[PDB]
Amino acid sequence: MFEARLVQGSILKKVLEALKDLINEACWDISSSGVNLQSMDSSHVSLVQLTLRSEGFDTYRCDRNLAMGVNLTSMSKILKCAGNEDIITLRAEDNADTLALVFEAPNQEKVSDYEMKLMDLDVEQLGIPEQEYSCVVKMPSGEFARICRDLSHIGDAVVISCAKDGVKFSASGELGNGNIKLSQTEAVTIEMNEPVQLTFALRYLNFFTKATPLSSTVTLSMSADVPLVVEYKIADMGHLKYYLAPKI
Amino acid sequence: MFEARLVQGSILKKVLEALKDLINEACWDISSSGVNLQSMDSSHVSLVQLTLRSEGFDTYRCDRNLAMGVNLTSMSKILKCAGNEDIITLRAEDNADTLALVFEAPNQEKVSDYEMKLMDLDVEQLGIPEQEYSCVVKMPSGEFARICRDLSHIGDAVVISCAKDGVKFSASGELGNGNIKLSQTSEEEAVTIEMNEPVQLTFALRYLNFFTKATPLSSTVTLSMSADVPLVVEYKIADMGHLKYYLAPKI
Amino acid sequence: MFEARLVQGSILKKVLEALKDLINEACWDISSSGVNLQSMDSSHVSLVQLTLRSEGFDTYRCDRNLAMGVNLTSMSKILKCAGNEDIITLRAEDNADTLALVFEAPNEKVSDYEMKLMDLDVEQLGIPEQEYSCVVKMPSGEFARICRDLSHIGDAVVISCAKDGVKFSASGELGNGNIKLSQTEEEAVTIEMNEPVQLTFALRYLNFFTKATPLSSTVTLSMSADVPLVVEYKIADMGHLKYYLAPKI
Amino acid sequence: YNPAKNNYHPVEDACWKPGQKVPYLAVARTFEKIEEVSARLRMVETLSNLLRSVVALSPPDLLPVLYLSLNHLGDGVLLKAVAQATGRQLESVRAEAAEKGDVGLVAENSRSTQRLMLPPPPLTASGVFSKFRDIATAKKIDIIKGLFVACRHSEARFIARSLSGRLRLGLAEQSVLAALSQAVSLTPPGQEFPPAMVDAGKGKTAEARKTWLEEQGMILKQTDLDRIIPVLLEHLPEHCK
């Protein structure tokens, strides 16, 4: 029998709202260390990598290793019942294919419960490519959100680059072209080994950036001819990564 | 000759805003006691009754028991233009088939007024027999609206259950199953129930979601029903009168 | 070698949003004295006038008279990407078909966009000035409310003036009604009278002209017997926005 | 994989192992090689090399590959599915679809531009043809997204042309029926592996080979192909009537 208890119902809501539009069906791995999600998108262009480690959970129990999946749209539909400060309880059975959510108000007068249905899948997986990166930047979340939401009205691709002066996003389109530069300093910081050029599709960056309210900051780290990472660190419970394959 | 005035002019905006979605034609019956309005739904599934006491109006005078009928959506749109703080005056002649509405701003710097087309309506009357109930519920209107919205995402009908400890709102559907339990709280955020036997009924959740459009009329709803008889939801508007929506139990 | 800088990007955004649908194409009259724009609407019912006095620009640099052409929809789409408190500057070279709009943060972030021009040979028609017989100056919020309210009853409004107050009146299929105003700090109407007038107007185009209310606390309505209405908006020291509309017969 | 070489061999020039399902990449590569040669006889010889290789490795696989070749079982749905499966934006790629050629050249160029993730499993002709019969709105865009992502090098153009119902490869049903007639003539069915026959016309003169092929083609045209093909591989003028 699996159980998880959390006081921060806001973060569970924010995570599902960051995923509900990018992935329809997803496989969870549940272990003593925490819950894992490691899913592909339908077009097989972006890799979503998630980690919620148990030490930040207010209560946790995993007697049996479990590897359930569920459809994210119907879980997002059920989760809009919870109030912003509600206590969230997750529980499941190791034999049956069902997930029970019970929503507890901050004050104890009302309690809600919800049986979501479940199924088993063995979605294809690919391992984390651990590597060094020549390029890495730390910049605040809202600036990257502004940048993607702005460039998405001009062009179709973002041509990222980095220089001894700072970073530069650039995009071109039917109405015009533009670039945006940030100089090296809530601040921007860069560790830089050698300049590089890439190209990326804004559609997936718009999809990723819905995670904005999870963390005040983001890390873009990358290298030549390999996927770029977009990292959001959750407050003292885990992290969320996205990957996007470079165009050529 | 008939005339009326109200200083709290927003409540008429509210009572028409709740009703525009439920019915389209109605009889405004008028008499020495005050305003009376009874009707049936566009699908004959719900009964509405509305009354306003003349002693709640700031100025009133009635010399004949008029009857008149008006297109309800038109009167909801005419009233939508008025400002939420303004003063309402309602005037009508006994012979002339026309309504007169005035919208007085609080500082009298702008005067709004409008006149609307009556039509002769043959809508029947079905005076509800009066009785006791097995249970009565008082609870916050904003919470009932929340739970009735929240169930609407699961499935198309609610079964509503009562027990000595409280009440159970229960729904099945394609996505799953759920129920919500409420119990007594030890003036506007305190629920209360009184009961003489536990009860278990079912209702069409769409009609409750239409009924809860009136949540800004009062802090407290009154939910009440008995064995196989219509569900009555009642709202006490501020000292003026009462609004109640009826729904016979689905089978 | 044209250079212009403005420290209140909210003005440039607001004026460009006031034109986003009413006008498709326009030409800018860049000259040593500032920026000007006259144009007519998509259905040829209503003229607009925009004036941008060179004194309203914190650094201005022009060399020769220049007309330029850009589609307001695309320029608006770029401008919806600027921050509402950024410094904005416009740059172009007198020979090239490309306009540079550079935005700067209040503190590190430089963002610039290049908009491709297009050539035009458009005609500009002004309008003669004359001493209007009845003028009203009244709060912009009350004007937007009245034009939204009466449009729910019918596409026709009639207006008349009286010794104490101007009256806005309408009638429709479902009923009729009117709003009285009376002479009475910014919240106060002022009316001046010369002779009584009674004219009818189209609600739709008044709604379309009313999209610029956040430019000015108050507005001026200029009307008279048998002549086009003028709706007047004055920006803080920068210049004015004006709209014209003739009555129905 | 190419069949355009002079004296090409249906045995040693095959693109797949015996007992492996037929890949669509060789089919697409053939369709573009045919589009590059205007000669109807050189096209027919190319199709005869394909069909001869198909009967040599996968005798059951002939009905699908012929049905695809004859296209026997809207543009906005196609463009929507291409946009949904290839990234960018439906409105932005719709500008790219103007002034250029057919949607297939936008589709293949996009699948060329994104370096993509890992290579998916290659589409087999039986899988493709089975998917098309199920394809004849949300169901449609989902399955068409699965076709487009799987495209390995250049197949996207011929997939799009197949969905548009306007393949226009330069041949017709009777041309491929004759291509099958010389295919079955140069390599008869019912062989025991390894097939000792690879070119039955060896030692016939040019006129004798032309007359023999035309007489074999005359038996095919006179004889629904869904019962013609299983009878042809199992054995004809008496077996069908």
Author numbering:
A (entry chain G): 1 to 185, 193 to 255
B (entry chain E): 1 to 186, 191 to 255
C (entry chain F): 1 to 107, 109 to 185, 191 to 255
D (entry chain A): 266 to 338, 350 to 412, 420 to 506, 512 to 523, 528 to 533
Paper excerpt:
During lagging strand synthesis, DNA Ligase 1 (Lig1) cooperates with the sliding clamp PCNA to seal the nicks between Okazaki fragments generated by Pol δ and Flap endonuclease 1 (FEN1). Lig1 comprises an unstructured N-terminal region (residues 1–262) and three folded domains (DNA binding domain, DBD; Adenylation domain, AdD; and OB-fold domain, OBD).
The second class (Class 2), termed “open conformer”, yielded an interpretable map at 4.2 Å resolution. Compared to the complex reconstituted without ATP, the open conformer is characterized by a different orientation of the DBD relative to PCNA, lack of density for the OBD, and poor definition of the AdD and DNA. The open conformer shows that nicked DNA can associate to the Lig1-PCNA complex in a partially bent conformation. The map quality, however did not allow a definitive modeling of the AdD and DNA, thus only the coordinates for the DBD and PCNA have been deposited in the PDB. In addition, the structure may be the product of multiple turnovers of the ligation reaction, whereby the released adenylated DNA may have rebound adenylated Lig1, and therefore its assignment to a functional state across the reaction is not possible. While the details of the handover mechanism are unknown, it is possible that Lig1 captures the nicked DNA in a partially bent conformation, analogous to that observed in the open conformer of the Lig1−DNA−PCNA complex reported here, where the flexible OBD would make the AdD-DBD subcomplex accessible for DNA transfer.
